Write a protein that binds this DNA or RNA. Structure first.
Length: 54
RNA sequence: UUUUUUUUUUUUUUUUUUUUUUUUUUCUCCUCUUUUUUUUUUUU
């Protein structure tokens, strides 16, 4: 479980980039399920990163 | 005996206004027959 988190943060970028395409076309049927996936993917272990973040 | 790297949720907020129910048409139009008109009066 070291490459799973990196695969996750690679997937979330393309799902964050499909919204701009659905908005460009004008088809929010997919642009809504991409927003739901984007909010359904964000966990807290992903953002842990380093020790002295803040 | 299968390594290394590929960032992410638009920036902004400390804008004035001194009025008053309604609202605006329809034309001139043959009234039939015992009458002058009776009348005081009293019991409410």
């Amino acid at each position: 479980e070291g490459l799973v988190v990196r695969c996750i943060q690679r997937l979330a970028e393309m799902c964050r980039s499909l919204r701009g395409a659905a908005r460009l076309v004008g088809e929010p049927v997919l642009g809504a399920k991409m927003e739901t996936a984007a909010t359904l993917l964000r966990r807290d272990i992903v953002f842990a990163a380093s020790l002295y973040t803040q």
